[PDB]
Design a protein around this ligand. Structure first.
Ligand SMILES: O=[N+]([O-])c1ccc(O[C@@H]2O[C@H](CO)[C@@H](O)[C@H](O)[C@H]2F)c([N+](=O)[O-])c1
Ligand SMILES: [Zn+2]
Length: 478
């Protein structure tokens, strides 16, 4: 018990959102379709409630209320994402620049600043242009790099006078693993035997190609930022990565080496190229010629290409050793030879949230942060996402739905765990809660609510503060 005053001076507290999950106005103000527009409309069976982001939380119209809601809590900063196809309706410069899209984000930024809230902007939060998907399969083509670079530069030119904090990509792990290994997220590609039962793809090659291309697009974009923009705009640029914490299934050395392989595959996949200039050893060994290779020039470009690392933490998994399968079912999912579970001998690692993958384990938050400290030279970190969900329940009266004690408990323990890690030397500068509002939770649609504020989808998307909102107001005092 635990308040802002417990944290170092200058420490930043905020909330996070993303364009597709919040904005709505999908076909409004000249916005082009993204792969998630396509994905939700053509494959509604892949969304738990067959829903889409057409309206979402209507932030495109209601963003002033959002800023008001953050301000009432005393938030320092807002993490949001720009929709690529709101700026470049068909992905590329030559396809035309959408003026009305630029106006919207200017309005959002100006509104935030008029109320003392600093904007942290994610360039890519999965809403990849459909036109570039159709043209060359999006991130499976090296052509994506320049189109991304051109998109990024328009953001630097239009917004960089006021925006001082930039994130290139959000959770490339999630994007690549779910989009191309399991095919459960857009663009919904995978091997036929894999979970998404996709019509096209290869779970053993495509995840790696996609993410390789994201890393190159990231590095190119950082380089560009530092070369042309950083001198006069004096902002910072980084990237947001997820990691679970991995507890060895038992005390055996092989289970310990599995947990190490799990983290190498989920997290080191991006961290090692960024810190050491190449993919993890276990990745190059186990994946072989299915993993692309950096040229010497590419390695130089990727190494050290960041001002900070955004870190997302939600849960822990047990990690157990797995024999090679051995043969013709190569998938990124199994490539690690680590079997991931949240339950061990019928005992869940922590209480299970509404998301079936989300188990409450505050300990691992600290563990992850210290792992980063000890193994990656303690880089500047912001916690770009942390949070939990409850079910969307149409039978509960409104006032019962606002009582999110489980969320308060989640934040209480995780903030304590974050504090202890900081006190033990973790180079952490800020913290963003996922998320400000209930929103479109991807393949879970609206069946699940992550918000500190309730959104009534059946009453014009009206916002209501949950109990946790009040809790954060207290916490954020002075
Ligand atoms: O399945 N996963 O391993 C996994 C990881 C991060 C995930 O999601 C992350 O955190 C939030 C809550 O989940 C999302 O709304 C964010 O947009 C995303 F960054 C998701 N996901 O959104 O479905 C899934
Ligand atoms: Zn509206």
């Amino acid at each position: 018990p635990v308040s802002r005053r417990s944290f170092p001076k200058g420490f930043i507290f905020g909330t996070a959102s993303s364009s597709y999950q919040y904005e709505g106005g999908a076909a409004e103000g000249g916005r082009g379709p993204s792969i998630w527009d396509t994905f939700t409309h053509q494959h509604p069976e892949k969304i738990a409630d067959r829903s889409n982001g057409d309206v979402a939380s209507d932030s495109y119209h209601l963003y002033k209320e959002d800023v008001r809601l953050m301000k009432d809590m005393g938030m320092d900063a807002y993490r949001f994402s720009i929709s690529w196809t709101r700026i470049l309706p068909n992905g590329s410069l030559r396809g035309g620049v959408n003026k009305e899209g630029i106006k919207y984000y200017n309005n959002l930024i100006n509104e935030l600043l008029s109320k003392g809230v600093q904007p942290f902007i994610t360039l890519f939060h999965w809403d990849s242009p459909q036109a570039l998907e159709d043209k060359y399969n999006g991130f499976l083509s090296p052509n994506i790099i320049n189109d991304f670079k051109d998109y990024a530069e328009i953001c630097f030119k239009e917004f960089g006078d006021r925006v001082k904090n930039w994130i290139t990509f959000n959770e490339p792990w999630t994007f690549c693993s779910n989009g191309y290994a399991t095919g459960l997220f857009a663009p919904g590609r995978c091997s036929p035997w894999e979970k998404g039962n996709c019509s096209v793809g290869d779970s053993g090659r495509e995840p790696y190609t996609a993410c390789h291309h994201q890393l190159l697009a990231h590095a190119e974009t950082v380089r560009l930022y530092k070369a042309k923009y950083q001198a006069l705009q004096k902002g910072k640029i980084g990237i947001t990565l997820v990691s679970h914490w991995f507890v060895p299934f038992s005390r055996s050395k092989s289970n310990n080496d599995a947990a190490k392989r799990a983290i190498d595959f989920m997290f080191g996949w991006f961290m090692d190229p960024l810190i050491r200039g190449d993919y993890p050893l276990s990745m190059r060994g186990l994946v072989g010629n299915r993993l692309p290779q950096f040229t010497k020039e590419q390695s130089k470009l990727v190494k050290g290409a960041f001002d900070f690392i955004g870190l997302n933490y939600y849960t822990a998994n047990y990690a157990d050793n797995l024999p090679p399968s051995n043969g013709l079912n190569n998938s990124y999912t199994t490539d690690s030879r680590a079997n991931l579970t949240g339950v061990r001998n019928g005992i869940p690692i922590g209480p299970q949230a509404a998301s079936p993958w989300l188990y409450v384990y505050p300990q691992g938050f600290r563990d992850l942060l210290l792992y980063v400290k000890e193994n990656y030279g303690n880089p500047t970190v912001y916690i770009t996402e942390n949070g939990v969900d409850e079910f969307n329940n149409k039978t509960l009266p409104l006032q019962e739905a606002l009582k999110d004690d489980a969320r308060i408990e989640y934040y209480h323990k995780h903030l304590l765990s974050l504090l202890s890690a900081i006190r033990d030397g973790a180079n952490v500068k800020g913290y963003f809660a996922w998320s400000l509002l209930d929103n479109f939770e991807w393949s879970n649609g609206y069946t699940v609510r992550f918000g500190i504020n309730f959104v009534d989808y059946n009453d014009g998307r009206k916002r209501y503060p949950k109990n946790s909102a009040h809790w954060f107001k207290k916490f954020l005092l002075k």
